[PDB]
Design a protein around this ligand. Sequence first.
Ligand SMILES: CC(=O)SCCNC(=O)CCNC(=O)[C@H](O)C(C)(C)COP(=O)(O)OP(=O)(O)OC[C@H]1O[C@@H](n2cnc3c(N)ncnc32)[C@H](O)[C@@H]1OP(=O)(O)O
Ligand SMILES: CC(=O)SCCNC(=O)CCNC(=O)[C@H](O)C(C)(C)COP(=O)(O)OP(=O)(O)OC[C@H]1O[C@@H](n2cnc3c(N)ncnc32)[C@H](O)[C@@H]1OP(=O)(O)O
Ligand SMILES: Cc1ncc(C[n+]2csc(CCOP(=O)(O)OP(=O)(O)O)c2C)c(N)n1
Ligand SMILES: Cc1ncc(C[n+]2csc(CCOP(=O)(O)OP(=O)(O)O)c2C)c(N)n1
Ligand SMILES: [Mg+2]
Ligand SMILES: [Mg+2]
Lengths: 872, 872
Amino acid sequence: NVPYTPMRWAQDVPNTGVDKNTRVMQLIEAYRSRGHLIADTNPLSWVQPGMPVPDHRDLDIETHNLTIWDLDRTFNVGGFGGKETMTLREVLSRLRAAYTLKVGSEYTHILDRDERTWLQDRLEAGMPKPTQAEQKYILQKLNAAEAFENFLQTKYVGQKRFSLEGAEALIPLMDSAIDTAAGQGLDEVVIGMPHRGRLNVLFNIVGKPLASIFNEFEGQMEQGQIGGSGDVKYHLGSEGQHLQMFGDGEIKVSLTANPSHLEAVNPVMEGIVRAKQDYLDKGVDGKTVVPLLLHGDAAFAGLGIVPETINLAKLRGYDVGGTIHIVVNNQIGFTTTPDSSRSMHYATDYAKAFGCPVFHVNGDDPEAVVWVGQLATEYRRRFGKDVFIDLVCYRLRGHNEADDPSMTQPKMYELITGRETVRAQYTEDLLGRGDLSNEDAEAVVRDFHDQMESVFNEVKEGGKKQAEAQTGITGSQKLPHGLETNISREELLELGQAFANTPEGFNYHPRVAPVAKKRVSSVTEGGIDWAWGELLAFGSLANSGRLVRLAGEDSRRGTFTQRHAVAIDPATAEEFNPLHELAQSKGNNGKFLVYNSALTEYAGMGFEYGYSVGNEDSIVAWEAQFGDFANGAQTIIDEYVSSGEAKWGQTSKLILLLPHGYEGQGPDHSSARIERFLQLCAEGSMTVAQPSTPANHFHLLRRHALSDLKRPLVIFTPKSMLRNKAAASAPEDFTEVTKFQSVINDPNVADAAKVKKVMLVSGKLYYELAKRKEKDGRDDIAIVRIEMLHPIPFNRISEALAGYPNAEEVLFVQDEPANQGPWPFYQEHLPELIPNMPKMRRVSRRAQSSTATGVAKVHQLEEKQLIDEAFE
Amino acid sequence: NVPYTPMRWAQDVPNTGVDKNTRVMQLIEAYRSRGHLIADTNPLSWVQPGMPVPDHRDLDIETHNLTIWDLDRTFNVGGFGGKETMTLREVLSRLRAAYTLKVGSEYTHILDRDERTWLQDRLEAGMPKPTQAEQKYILQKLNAAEAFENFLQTKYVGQKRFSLEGAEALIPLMDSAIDTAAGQGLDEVVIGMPHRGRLNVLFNIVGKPLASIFNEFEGQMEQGQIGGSGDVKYHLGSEGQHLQMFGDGEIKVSLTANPSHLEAVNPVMEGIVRAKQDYLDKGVDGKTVVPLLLHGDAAFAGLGIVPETINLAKLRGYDVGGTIHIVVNNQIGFTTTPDSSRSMHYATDYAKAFGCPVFHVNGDDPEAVVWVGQLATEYRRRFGKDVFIDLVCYRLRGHNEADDPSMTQPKMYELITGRETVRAQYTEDLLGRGDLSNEDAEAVVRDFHDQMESVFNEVKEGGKKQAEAQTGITGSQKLPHGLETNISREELLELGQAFANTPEGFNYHPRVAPVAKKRVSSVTEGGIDWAWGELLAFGSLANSGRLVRLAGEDSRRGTFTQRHAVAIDPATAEEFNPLHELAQSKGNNGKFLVYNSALTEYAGMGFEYGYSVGNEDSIVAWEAQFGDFANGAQTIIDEYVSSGEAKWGQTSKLILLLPHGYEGQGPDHSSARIERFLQLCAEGSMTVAQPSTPANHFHLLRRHALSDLKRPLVIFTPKSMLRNKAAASAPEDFTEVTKFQSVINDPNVADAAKVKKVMLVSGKLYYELAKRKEKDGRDDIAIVRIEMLHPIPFNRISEALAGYPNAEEVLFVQDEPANQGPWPFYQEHLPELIPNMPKMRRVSRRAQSSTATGVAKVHQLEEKQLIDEAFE
Ligand SMILES: CC(=O)SCCNC(=O)CCNC(=O)[C@H](O)C(C)(C)COP(=O)(O)OP(=O)(O)OC[C@H]1O[C@@H](n2cnc3c(N)ncnc32)[C@H](O)[C@@H]1OP(=O)(O)O
Ligand SMILES: CC(=O)SCCNC(=O)CCNC(=O)[C@H](O)C(C)(C)COP(=O)(O)OP(=O)(O)OC[C@H]1O[C@@H](n2cnc3c(N)ncnc32)[C@H](O)[C@@H]1OP(=O)(O)O
Ligand SMILES: Cc1ncc(C[n+]2csc(CCOP(=O)(O)OP(=O)(O)O)c2C)c(N)n1
Ligand SMILES: Cc1ncc(C[n+]2csc(CCOP(=O)(O)OP(=O)(O)O)c2C)c(N)n1
Ligand SMILES: [Mg+2]
Ligand SMILES: [Mg+2]
């Protein structure tokens, strides 16, 4: 059992052609670059049958024209090993000790010279010898891990727990990293992980009490929100403190909630870290909250969310100072082996796309694992980049504790069954080298087992409660009754002037300058458009002292060239942000931050959800280029935004801005899928709206921000109505009207006793129906708008309908096909809530498999047909 | 304007320490590895503010301790340039000519020695000088590209076309690759691409007639399916032939349809290629259909689907022999620059994760572009791997032709406006070197313009038609009336025996052997379970002579350990596939292929959809581990599966198998979201079913496969009912019952005149209601099952209800919450279709924000409450 190729027999060769010093330098370079291919990093003596084996002929002395006859000759090595001269025997010895034992390293692909040199120097010095106290501490942590698993196995046999047996070195690795961070003087560590070994990390790293975990197994579950539904035990989070064992440091440790969908926590935990860093406010030399992210081997190589999130690492609105990644490589999926899971040689090969170092370590050598953890945390602090650790280990049982792995992997489980554990091997090694006594080794085991037995008995004394029905979360938060959302006239004029107070030698672009002038004059003469209404809302909130963040694709300029929140000078390329300047000059330390995202919907929306959870007092909004591209983030909508409160008691106030409207641009530029969002709504989970005037958009945003109702808000924004002059607003609507309106009654009814038809509408189709009513002189019709879709404002609709006492019909008019839009939701729910209402009649487009037509002339024909049908 | 650092002044250094020959060899290695960092590959003299500049100090002679005084000394170079000895002046000259001009190359990261040597040899030989005929051919293609763009600009000013101006060298690059493939003797080339330059590729590469394109611009659109809705002009496909210009070769060229969602065509086009290769059947040395895939720079770096699809390249059921990738790098997104789009230095850095070569080429040197195209196609044929080309160019106008790019990128568009085009530069170069006459150069332009003018006039003679309403696609395909789907008794016994005809020294695993015995005995004694019913269906179809493909996560064994389609011997690890053996021994050349996928839902389902389009006569099925993970493939469901026929006239017969059932395993292991699928259904777009007996599943699959209705099928499969003994089937149900049943009436009604309540149910809740009815002895109830959900079998439901003439109530019973499951769909539609039916009454769980509870005791309490409410 020796891992190297034997020395071969050959004749001595002449020193002609390429000199032999050149050949020894090429050998040094080959080991530094490719020595990881023959390193002792696998605990099993296992080669997977269907995977390609890379060529490693570069690592034998025959390929470089050297021979056994050169081993005692002396060569120039140019500073290698801190020496100018050396023998080939000593060169080989040093290379093999540094690159071929229990740690394999990849770092030669890095482009910067100072980075490479730092790693090379530390990797060739070697691992320093640890003290006896340190060694005993590693043994205590290994014992805790294994003991906890065995206890649960014995007391709860059938129950599913996802054990860590085979990979117990994870606990001392995570402990090493957190300890190093506490020594550097940082503030917090945030963890995200999957199912494998979660209950073990909660108890041994985060500090969740043991009574809580035993209660969970007996069927008593802690309640997050009053009337909530809950979730399984390996999807929950917690908080705690960590004290340095040999130091005076202290750090805070947190773990975040997640669903079963793998790798969906990656963008969410990045956002939590960014929000916490922004609140501390320590600058460019700060970045004092550390992200620690755990993965599995199959998931890391397979799912596309992983590289999509790593791509945000060095961008302006997303940087968090680097991420420490740990991949638990146990050489198997569920029933699938690596040959069917990836086309890369290693699972951690995405690192080479981003220019980052990788460390592969054997999971049966605990002292090497502790060294790699320390070295990774130091690299992050100095260079501010991502680092990857690959922990090679195995899985002792099946995927869960009810599965038999021998059915599909017979030969692999011949090597696994009946091994000795990592705790047993380490105890034997220390007793051999005289580093520990037997009394000590026996106390370590006895003490921990007594502790667990004590707690267990205490938990069984208390009787078990019986099951009870879950009530719901509708009334668990209060509604803001009697809140006024209008600003003063002085405040409005100041916001207007912000766009005239340019810096010293700044000029606008000729096509942007008219927009600025109109903003300054409109706050006194009238004609405020949609974009200006939105910015007035965010600006007012930033003045009062809040952090406002807006992110999305092309969101600084706007997709439809409507926003202009940051302007650029054509001559010098200088930037200007008016509303941020005004906010910083009022002495409440408010901020208005606008960012252009990368081209992603899954990672984008996930990052903003995380930001809202990490800072409860910020106002965050994510914008989509068109609302039709939000189905690329369906996982986030279904697993976090729509259902997080009912499952975990985690609340958010994220704002989604989704453009919507039927205008003839085709099936992928027409609908944001209102019907889908209204399906997800129940128990008052979130608010859904489609306003028709800039002032009403202003009031909706301000009510959300100033209330104490911590639930999300989904708005359906316009595309063509942005520049419609019948939709503009007057200044009195921002300063004398006090509240948001959910139903707007018809403003052009001469006499209410002559009405015989009522039309209900939502959105931009109002302005067409109104136009036609004026042209044809119809005094028997009244058009009523619905601005808030969920919840249903049934008291207001009832009040409006009651105002027309001679009505015989009610029509519901929409632009969308009959199986889309708000009609399905309203035809089900509204008749129950208003019993005395006449039967409703739909007027819409026919039902379709796609969203809309692809021909423009057909679109125009359909619209004419629709409006004609509405007016008999 | 010289691109190199000037030679510096220094003193001569002594030849001591590290020898100077060693230093010259290190310089050669540095240029081979990192010389692309200073290559002349950008047509503009532009450096983006905000992007990091890599260190390239390795490329100057000072860092290797050499000086101007060494330039005329002679050194040993070890075969470089085919010489044993050389001067430092000649070394530098050769390195600069190979690695620093118009082509930059990355290949030193490849692990195989033979690959590296092949590339190195061809890259240092240089580009061979082309003939005059070849040069004139390149000029014809450049002219065609530019001329077409200018014509459309002049005749249709406002209309959106997404021009290729700035990147016209793409047309000769694609032509070079297709020409090389025709010389190798291959069969087809399949293309997938986005919006940028699509109408140009359709006319100049694929051969779509010009009349068709002009008609599109005048509003006359070609119809795909009778009564279809359509799509915009830059989302359509076509077919054609390509003849070799200087050869006797011929090849077929195809382009595939796609939606606006970027990069969603990547898995679909890979599947099309695999299906075509399988039909030709030329073996391991075949792989004679070439995939050619075009991207944009922002999309390639940002979206996660790209690396997820590249990861399938070398896997057993997905390999297609390599893919040629082209990235059109025009240095801008929409309004976003590379500094805000990626954290990699180049857009093509994912190549380094997979071990593949990259070529960067200047888009204003057309002869170099043609060389790189040829070299890439040769590399693919020899090594069978992926290859990446980065074409560096610019965008002349805005994102579309209605946008002003100076608002946000002022300095970049100072360099672009008023340049001379690539056609103009190339014409000037050839006239200078005496390679072309003026008469020739003028004829090239005049001839092409005359051709276009001719066609245009012809198109305007014919009058324009007026718009007409679109009718729908419901009746465009026929239903299989009078088809019988039963097999013979002889066929059933033969299928059974397949599991007894083991190879010579094969034995089953002890926990798999009972399953095999039961399969052999059940075909004569009874008790056939769910999994065996499914396999009997697929086996029968493979016997008749069809290719059957089943793919999914852990689909060979089954997630619930139920299928065992391939078995493994514990002693030797040999594999056995019974139903494939039987099919190949019947002389119709049938196949049963089962594969375990990687851990992906987006790339998995996309690949299977593509397979169904590439071979219309195959039976393809994709399986999900649980139906709750299908929201990771929402793009494919919404943009391709649900709506492809109505948009493009593209038909498919894919089968989706989605596990579903409420059993107490929590919110991410309970629902496949039936409500979402029933929203997408209209115009008879696809079939949705939830069967309750193995025989009925058998008949459903066989009706789909033997009919001529080319639409998809979505089935909701069980988890616990897999092993329920009340659900098993007898042999007569496969051999004497002729058809599939859509409604199953109650089999335990003594007297039909005493019934006073009818219950409607679907799925596994039947077996609980039936149980209770027997226990309590209720003769006033009848339970009726619905097996096909869409379309609605309203004639059968009417017939069943009419059989009970004294009924007073109808109850609809489901397990799902009230805002989920089939109730929303049925409460809307069923009362209209059956006017005389009593009012329906719901019995279900309450409405919820999440799918299900997380506590198991609460689940049991809810189920009891539900069934009690049903029975008064
Ligand atoms: C979904 C959520 O965010 S929590 C909703 C929880 N409640 C329910 O779902 C119970 C059933 N629903 C209902 O009774 C109705 O839909 C209601 C009460 C929410 C609204 O019905 P109406 O009375 O017709 O609506 P109206 O617009 O008059 O609202 C009344 C008050 O509620 C407030 N309000 C209503 N919806 C919201 C909301 N989403 N956010 C904040 N305040 C709200 C209004 O500001 C108003 O305050 P005021 O009394 O100071 O003027
Ligand atoms: C969605 C698709 O795949 S195409 C559907 C197109 N048609 C429509 O949508 C029109 C409206 N729909 C209807 O009228 C009804 O829903 C129907 C006609 C589909 C079924 O009505 P019912 O008579 O209640 O159902 P039933 O199951 O008895 O169907 C009768 C016949 O239709 C056939 N059939 C029904 N649905 C399908 C289907 N999805 N695939 C194949 N055959 C089908 C049955 O095989 C049967 O054939 P048979 O006459 O040889 O016995
Ligand atoms: C997105 C998604 N797809 C599929 C699954 C089903 N699933 C659960 S565990 C698992 C295997 C995970 O393998 P690996 O990442 O190696 O985890 P390990 O069991 O080794 O810790 C799969 C496919 C899932 N939960 N989420
Ligand atoms: C999935 C998705 N997200 C967003 C968009 C919106 N969109 C259309 S084009 C575009 C920019 C594409 O940039 P690039 O890939 O460089 O293309 P180019 O215009 O340079 O050809 C974006 C974000 C889209 N169509 N699809
Ligand atoms: Mg694993
Ligand atoms: Mg681009």
